[PDB]
Structure 1
Amino acid sequence: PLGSMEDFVRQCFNPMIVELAEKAMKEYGEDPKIETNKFAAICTHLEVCFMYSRFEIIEGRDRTMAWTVVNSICNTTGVEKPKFLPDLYDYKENRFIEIGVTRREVHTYYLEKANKIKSEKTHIHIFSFTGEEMATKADYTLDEESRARIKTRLFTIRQEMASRGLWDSFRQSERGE
């Protein structure tokens, strides 16, 4: 059987995650009931951001609050202000971080992200549903254990999707941003 991705999302992500992901989609004219593969990808990326985070979370916040927090950091510190909202701030390494979760080739996604943000200061850390990862300057920020826990959660999501006949389509549907 092929299950419903909306039903999977609502049952297999934390509701706080789901709600924030709905907001994020409603904000850009996308319907979580329609673009369900995207809805799941959005929840996944949110969960990864929250797992990864020492850190200020930017992702998930209303855009007004998110920019307020970003500007607040950029002038408590003196870090260059990003052109696009990042996902986190690392107080230890004094840098913003963009987090990616991809079902495509990690190098492909990494450079897409590098080319969009055009920043020499923002760190990029990409995770795949395969266990592969790629991070700016081969600086992985977190310890082995913390990153293996992220990759393990990605395997759980994938296998749960597979269980419901959802992985095939989900894995094939990612486009460039």
Structure 2
Amino acid sequence: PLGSMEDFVRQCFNPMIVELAEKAMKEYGEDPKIETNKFAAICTHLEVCFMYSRFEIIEGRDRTMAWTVVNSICNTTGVEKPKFLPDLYDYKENRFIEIGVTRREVHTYYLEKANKIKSEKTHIHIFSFTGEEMATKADYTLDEESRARIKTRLFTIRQEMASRGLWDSFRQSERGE
């Protein structure tokens, strides 16, 4: 009763999500059949981006199209150009957003992300599988039920992993970037 994380991924995520995630892994020479906890994390983070998004999706795009979209927004608006390539753009609050989904402590992950991107303008919003969240300046952007729907989906993933004996490994395998 330990299942295959690959089979879980292909069965419990939307195929559009799985295909984007495989595309993203193959781009970096990681194999979805091998690095399966990573495959699941990737799909989960994609699904959160899509649920969160008013918003232009950046994550999930081919890197040349993602930078085209970033540059196009930056040279249309005032906005500072990110050094990395965020997840979303918010046309309302006029800023890029980095979304994180973590199996570690949310403050730890948040500050890792803040330290990587070194931006005063890009908003960071971190979700955990425990239902904890942390967002830049305690500005949460979306309303309560929209964030609750994201947390609920995270719990559903976790329980469905547990059901297959996949949670233990998945939850223990996250490293710093």
Q: Report the alpha carbon displacement of residue 55 of structure 1 after superposing the two structures with TM.
A: 0.2
Q: Report the alpha carbon displacement of residue 171 of structure 1 after superposing the two structures with TM.
A: 0.2
Q: Deviations over 1:28-87 (max 9, x none)?
A: 010000000000000000000000000000000000000000000001112000000100
SS of 1:108 mapped into structure 2:
helix
Q: Deviations over 1:4-42 (max 9, x none)?
A: 000000000000000000000000010000000000000
With the length of structure 2 as denominator, give the TM-score of the two structures: 1.00
Superposed structure 1 runs of 4+ greater than 6 Å apart: none
- Partner Cα distance (2:88, 2:98) in 1: 7
Give the CA RMSD over aligned residues: 0.3
Q: Deviations over 1:130-165 (max 9, x none)?
A: 000000000000000000000000000000000000
- Partner Cα distance (1:127, 1:133) in 2: 5
Could you list the runs of 5+ residues in structure 1 that have no partner in the other structure? none
Q: Percent identity?
A: 100
SS of 2:89 mapped into structure 1:
strand
Q: Report the alpha carbon displacement of residue 169 of structure 1 after superposing the two structures with TM.
A: 0.1
Q: Which residue of 2 aligns with 1:128?
A: 128
- Partner Cα distance (1:84, 1:149) in 2: 28
- Partner Cα distance (1:23, 1:83) in 2: 22
- Partner Cα distance (2:78, 2:34) in 1: 42
Q: Deviations over 1:114-141 (max 9, x none)?
A: 0000000000000000000000000000
- Partner Cα distance (1:57, 1:77) in 2: 17
With the length of structure 1 as denominator, give the TM-score of the two structures: 1.00
